[PDB]
Amino acid sequence: GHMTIARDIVLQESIGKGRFGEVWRGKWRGEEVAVKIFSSREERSWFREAEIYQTVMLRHENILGFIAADNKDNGTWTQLWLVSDYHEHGSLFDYLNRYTVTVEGMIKLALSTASGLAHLHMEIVGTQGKPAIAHRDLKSKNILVKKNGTCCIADLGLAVRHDSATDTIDIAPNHRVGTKRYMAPEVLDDSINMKHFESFKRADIYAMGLVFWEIARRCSIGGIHEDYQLPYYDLVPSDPSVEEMRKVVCEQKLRPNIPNRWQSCEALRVMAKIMRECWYANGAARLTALRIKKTLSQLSQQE
Numbered sequence: 001g002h003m004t005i006a007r008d009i010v011l012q013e014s015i016g017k018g019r020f021g022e023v024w025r026g027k028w029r030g031e032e033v034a035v036k037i038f039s040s041r042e043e044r045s046w047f048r049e050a051e052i053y054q055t056v057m058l059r060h061e062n063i064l065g066f067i068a069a070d071n072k073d074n075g076t077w078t079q080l081w082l083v084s085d086y087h088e089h090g091s092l093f094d095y096l097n098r099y100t101v102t103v104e105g106m107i108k109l110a111l112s113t114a115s116g117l118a119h120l121h122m123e124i125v126g127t128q129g130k131p132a133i134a135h136r137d138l139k140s141k142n143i144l145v146k147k148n149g150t151c152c153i154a155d156l157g158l159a160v161r162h163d164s165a166t167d168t169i170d171i172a173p174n175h176r177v178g179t180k181r182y183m184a185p186e187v188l189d190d191s192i193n194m195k196h197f198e199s200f201k202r203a204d205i206y207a208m209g210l211v212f213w214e215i216a217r218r219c220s221i222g223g224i225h226e227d228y229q230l231p232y233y234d235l236v237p238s239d240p241s242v243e244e245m246r247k248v249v250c251e252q253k254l255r256p257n258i259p260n261r262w263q264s265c266e267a268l269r270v271m272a273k274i275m276r277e278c279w280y281a282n283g284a285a286r287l288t289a290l291r292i293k294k295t296l297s298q299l300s301q302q303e
């Protein structure tokens with residue numbers, strides 16, 4: 001047996017959680033892996049996440065490397081496991097909280113995030129085809145940072161997949177499923193047309209703009225940077241409700257503040273412009289992940 005299976009994995013350290021499930025660092029045949037553990041009553045969440053990660057042609061350097069879905073019976077109860085690559089830096093949230101980044105560092109984090117999202121959103125029609133996938137819960141706590149300073153998107157459990165041939169979404173989607181702070185205006189005010197798959201891709205773009213803002217604040221030039229904050233830290237309380245978010249984002253039409261200092265640097269000007277073009281209230285006006293990837297690729301080439 002060359003494939004990775006739960007019985008051959010030994011848990012070493014508690015490394016936080018997912019939306020559901022508790023995450024552990026484990027060792028499998030001398031290698032470190034991440035293990036997310038679900039109880040038997042969470043089978044639906046575990047299965048749906050296993051199903052998304054097993055999507056044909058999903059693997060990409062900027063998408064969390066999925067290893068296996070398995071069960072582990074300890075003799076008393078059964079644990080439902082998801083196994084993935086382990087990334088020592090943890091989340092982009094943790095990384096931005098601990099460190100400031102250089103201009104190069106910022107571009108690498110933003111471009112790799114956009115590249116993973118472009119891959120997730122991309123449909124490949126035909127044999128061994130890949131359905132377009134929308135995340136529905138993109139945020140800095142759901143992105144991991146690799147040793148090479150690039151990102152990979154994770155926590156795909158709330159994802160939705162599109163079948164173009166039938167023009168259907170694989171599940172009956174519930175309203176407002178993600179993290180309230182990052183919900184797009186149309187999700188907050190429930191005007192989103194959930195029968196149109198493009199609506200979910202657009203809502204992901206809004207959330208990515210918020211993540212770019214979080215990264216840009218940590219970009220240090222001449223030792224000048226902003227402290228770590230979540231988007232809307234200045235307007236909403238911790239654990240904000242849908243109503244608190246909707247009043248700020250939909251009624252007052254506010255977005256995270258773009259500081260004056262971001263105009264003094266070309267990379268920061270490009271980043272600020274992408275943010276504004278992710279934050280439009282009208283989802284159809286927003287940039288695509290593919291267009292953002294191309295813009296940031298052009299910027300990394302120049303740098």
Ligand SMILES: Cc1cccc(-c2ncn(CC(F)F)c2-c2ccc3nccn3c2)n1
Nearest residue numbers: 018034035036082083084086087142154155
């Ligand atoms: C399919 C699967 C298997 C195992 C873990 C996870 C996972 N879910 C949420 N997070 C946290 C964030 F990434 F969303 C992780 C996760 C993944 C890798 C990792 N390395 C260091 C900490 N890590 C946490 N997912």
